[PDB]
Fold Acetylcholinesterase.
Amino acid sequence: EDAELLVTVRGGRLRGIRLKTPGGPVSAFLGIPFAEPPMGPRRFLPPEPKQPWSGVVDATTFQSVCYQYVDTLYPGFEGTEMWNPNRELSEDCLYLNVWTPYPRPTSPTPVLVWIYGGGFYSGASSLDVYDGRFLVQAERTVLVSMNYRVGAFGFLALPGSREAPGNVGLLDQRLALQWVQENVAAFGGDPTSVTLFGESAGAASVGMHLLSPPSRGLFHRAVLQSGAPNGPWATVGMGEARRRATQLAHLVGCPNDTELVACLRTRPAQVLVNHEWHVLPQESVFRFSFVPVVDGDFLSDTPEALINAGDFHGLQVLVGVVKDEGSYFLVYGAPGFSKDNESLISRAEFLAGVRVGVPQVSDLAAEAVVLHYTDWLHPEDPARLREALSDVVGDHNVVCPVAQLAGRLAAQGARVYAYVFEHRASTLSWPLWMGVPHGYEIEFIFGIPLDPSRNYTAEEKIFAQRLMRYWANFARTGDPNEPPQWPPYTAGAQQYVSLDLRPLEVRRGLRAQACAFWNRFLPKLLSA
Amino acid sequence: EDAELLVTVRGGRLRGIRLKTPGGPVSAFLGIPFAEPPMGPRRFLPPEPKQPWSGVVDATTFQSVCYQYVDTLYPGFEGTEMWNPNRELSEDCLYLNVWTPYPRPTSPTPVLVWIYGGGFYSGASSLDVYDGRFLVQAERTVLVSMNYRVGAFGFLALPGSREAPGNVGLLDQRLALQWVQENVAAFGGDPTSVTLFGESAGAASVGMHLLSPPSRGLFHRAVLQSGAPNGPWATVGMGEARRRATQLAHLVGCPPTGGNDTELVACLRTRPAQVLVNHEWHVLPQESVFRFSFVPVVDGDFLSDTPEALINAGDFHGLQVLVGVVKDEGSYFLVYGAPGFSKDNESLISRAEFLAGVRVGVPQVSDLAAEAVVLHYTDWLHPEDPARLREALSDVVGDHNVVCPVAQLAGRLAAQGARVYAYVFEHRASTLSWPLWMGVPHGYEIEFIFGIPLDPSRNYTAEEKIFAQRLMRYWANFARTGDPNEPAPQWPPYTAGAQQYVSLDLRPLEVRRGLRAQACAFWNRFLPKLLSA
Ligand SMILES: *[C@@H]1O[C@H](CO[C@@H]2O[C@@H](C)[C@@H](O)[C@@H](O)[C@@H]2O)[C@@H](O[C@@H]2O[C@H](CO)[C@@H](O)[C@H](O)[C@H]2NC(C)=O)[C@H](O)[C@H]1NC(C)=O
Ligand SMILES: *[C@@H]1O[C@H](CO[C@@H]2O[C@@H](C)[C@@H](O)[C@@H](O)[C@@H]2O)[C@@H](O[C@@H]2O[C@H](CO)[C@@H](O)[C@H](O)[C@H]2NC(C)=O)[C@H](O)[C@H]1NC(C)=O
Ligand SMILES: *[C@@H]1O[C@H](CO[C@@H]2O[C@@H](C)[C@@H](O)[C@@H](O)[C@@H]2O)[C@@H](O[C@@H]2O[C@H](CO)[C@@H](O)[C@H](O)[C@H]2NC(C)=O)[C@H](O)[C@H]1NC(C)=O
Ligand SMILES: NC(=O)c1cc[n+](COC[n+]2ccccc2/C=N/O)cc1
Ligand SMILES: NC(=O)c1cc[n+](COC[n+]2ccccc2/C=N\O)cc1
Ligand SMILES: *[C@@H]1O[C@H](CO)[C@@H](O)[C@H](O)[C@H]1NC(C)=O
Ligand SMILES: *[P@](C)(=O)/N=C(\C)N(CC)CC
Ligand SMILES: *[P@](C)(=O)/N=C(\C)N(CC)CC
């Protein structure tokens, strides 16, 4: 047999598989159990470490995807199917994967740990677009990705109860991070140089590990792509978490917190998934029902509170956004929008869409948004309205939260690097008016264009190797630059670079004007 | 005697003078009494019409300036002395002036009626910059200007009182308009073609005559320069007027606070005029700029509702309006209180001084409202640039008080039937005394409207003289026909949608869009809703 493909971790022995890349072989260990299956009486509970096993665990294929909603809006359309589960669904789903150079490294190797996004209601470490084979071959890293529970299974909260305490999906991730500390050395990885990176809800979870002391000792650097823990969508208060969990029980026919969760545990997993979206208070976009809860435990305060109160010297983070963060979300509830036309909306549809994009704010607050995003010399132009509503959803949910994190961390000791990803892939199936949509920098950071089975151009391949080197340079040293320089982001200069096929261009300000509204003014308005 | 210099009006006979102008003789009748002198027991009362006289009244020089405060900030400096009284102060001051071509016209000719500004606390029709001889000579119109009471004398109000009903300074204006209607035909003017035009507080007053029905029958067209009735400074509520009137009285001895209105006004009437003037600004509640102690009050009489509400409910079909502003409306006001500002340095303020100036520029608003102002006028990529902050604060003062009020008026009047024309005056005069950073400051289009550069004793360039002749022709064309275009790039009507206006400077007309539409949307559409919640 191949001795490179057999590893002993603390729980027992594993057998991996060898994989081809256009640059050479890679060792992969897929489907490693890191937790006891959170099933039956273990539903909603914090994860238990996987008990040791005898024999050899088969680690040659991906394990199951945690139970989650499956999108049906454009069935068969690649733009939507690429995020849908590609393995069967199961509550037995707490498995992580390790990619490693072939032969396995002899010296400690920097570790990248990937946390997928999916609004905390979906996602899987087994998606084609999170394939780690290209990064570990091109950049000689160890890549780890784990599955964590999503939707109600990971984030249903009855705050105060021990039978449904909340944030257990976050605890799944932390447990995998503890698994890396105890076991990644057996694969050649260096546990003293772990770099977290994630996108969207994955980027939010990275930030929440930055702000939870128990997790902070498990990694050393962080990359947050198109997400932040301080969004309007990434956390929920205790009282709202309790209301949503209670309405879920009523929707599925149940029923004392003990009697409520006991009844929920009798229900097939598909039943809860089928109802999770209907506990949201308002019709909205970019809002998810079961997200992390601020109960003083995992997060002792709100992310913004912890961000402003934090000393962040000794931290290096890489943060960024795509050029058009909002367009993707508009075809999922904004009236007048669809990927199959130009979506040139009326002002009425624009006004309606602002309530959908900024749900559960006062009429005055909504009118303040309309004032900022209206061009009062062209108040009714359909094309400008389309691009303005996408600016609303994108700035409110991604750009401005990212900008606040970058500015606060920078001014409070951290070295920050910011990017805007401005390249529209030649393969992109979405219409042209959506620009560079949310999520579509991931395929380049993982080096998917190097797969010769796809039709990326030669320059997109070179571009992918540029990005993989930036990311891996940051993992290795905390500086993405090769030793046109990428300057650190600071609260004053607000400098970032644009990532596309032409060389690095340094620009100033992550929509400083629009984000002054969201980050500085709008909070004060909601207080009064 | 010269027969052209003798006219009979209703009151009796007048004798005027023949003025020499650069272009030829003009007959002037200066100092025509139109009301009984508002003295002693007539202080604070509405004007009563001038009773008939026997013999010939010599209307041969400007009469006195209505008692008012005199600016002392930059003594001897032309930029401020030009606005100060150039006649003796007196409460006996209700006189008007008539300029007419020499010889008098035999068929009726259109009439322009000027209403000076001065924040309702100052101003006079006698100021050199309001000389009507050039307009009359160059464009063949009858020009009328009047004095009206200012300060407490014009606008101290104890609403509901008989002894001080308020708005008497506006009634001074209305009485003069009534005078024009009955008497201008004797000077050759056409009482069926009367165009009101004023600047700043004068522009605000012109608008209040548009919105008060009893005045609306006395003119046909209006020109509003750098002012509007709906500004945050041109009116005041009944209770605040009462509060200021009562504290003014308290500060000067009356009564020996509040109580009975007749007894209180009777006591105020025994106080010398200068004593009242010397305490007028002590009643303003906060440190501010572009705010004035005694202004028109909204008491349901002269104005049945606020100018905003009246503008919204108005049917303005059959009305032609000419409105506009200067390029840098707010700079002039910053050297009168804004921390760090001076006409003698470049006033490159700090950010702290910017934030402090915002409170001075927008007084008596919630902290939230002040943060909203700071949000829209900060450049969050250059938040502490001294020059950018200096221009931003001037934009705050200008947009808040002038530009956006004018814009809201222009847009609502256009949408509700009126043909509106709008300008931005963008020429900095070669003779200007203010520093360069102030740009084209508030009030400095007037001299070109009145054709002052044609005075040979002045030192304007030749091109500025042609510019003066162009603007006078615009204003006179609008007065005659309601259209400033000569019967040459055309001047399009302002509409709420297209929002077109023209720029006035030494270059030919340039059409533009939007009177600071982004800024004004904040002032006219958002902030009103913030202040209610
Ligand atoms: C563009 O299309 C959208 C969405 O319409 C859908 O996609 C179209 C391509 C076509 O397949 C339709 O049959 C689909 O319904 C339009 O937005 C909708 O417009 C209809 C009225 O025609 C309205 O009843 C819906 O409420 C709108 N969408 C939603 C979800 O409310 C939009 O009007 C189209 N704009 C164009 C054609 O310019
Ligand atoms: C408020 O006071 C006025 C004026 O009072 C007069 O003058 C005072 C100094 C003192 O001499 C009083 O006695 C005087 O009456 C009142 O107006 C007068 O009211 C009386 C009684 O009705 C009447 O005979 C007088 O003619 C009025 N004089 C006027 C109108 O000038 C007024 O009634 C008082 N109102 C109150 C107390 O609310
Ligand atoms: C610019 O000048 C202003 C006003 O100062 C006046 O003008 C000067 C040229 C000089 O003639 C002074 O004597 C005048 O008083 C300055 O603002 C003042 O600054 C002083 C000193 O710091 C302070 O005590 C006053 O309170 C300030 N007054 C106001 C109204 O703010 C300003 O600091 C100068 N800025 C410069 C020079 O850049
Ligand atoms: N009656 C008063 O005491 C008084 C005091 C101050 N002001 C305002 O004057 C300051 N000011 C402020 C801005 C522009 C001009 C001027 C001066 N004009 O004469 C008016 C009345
Ligand atoms: N549990 C939920 O809140 C939820 C949210 C969204 N969706 C799917 O519909 C929204 N949607 C559909 C397609 C793509 C994106 C999105 C929204 N956010 O990502 C299902 C369940
Ligand atoms: C691009 O790739 C897809 C999937 O491999 C393939 O089906 C398609 O044929 C390629 N391009 C074209 C135009 O053939
Ligand atoms: P974020 C809102 O967590 N990301 C989502 C919803 N993605 C799917 C389009 C990217 C993984
Ligand atoms: P407005 C505020 O009435 N105008 C003023 C105070 N001026 C003085 C320069 C212009 C006449």
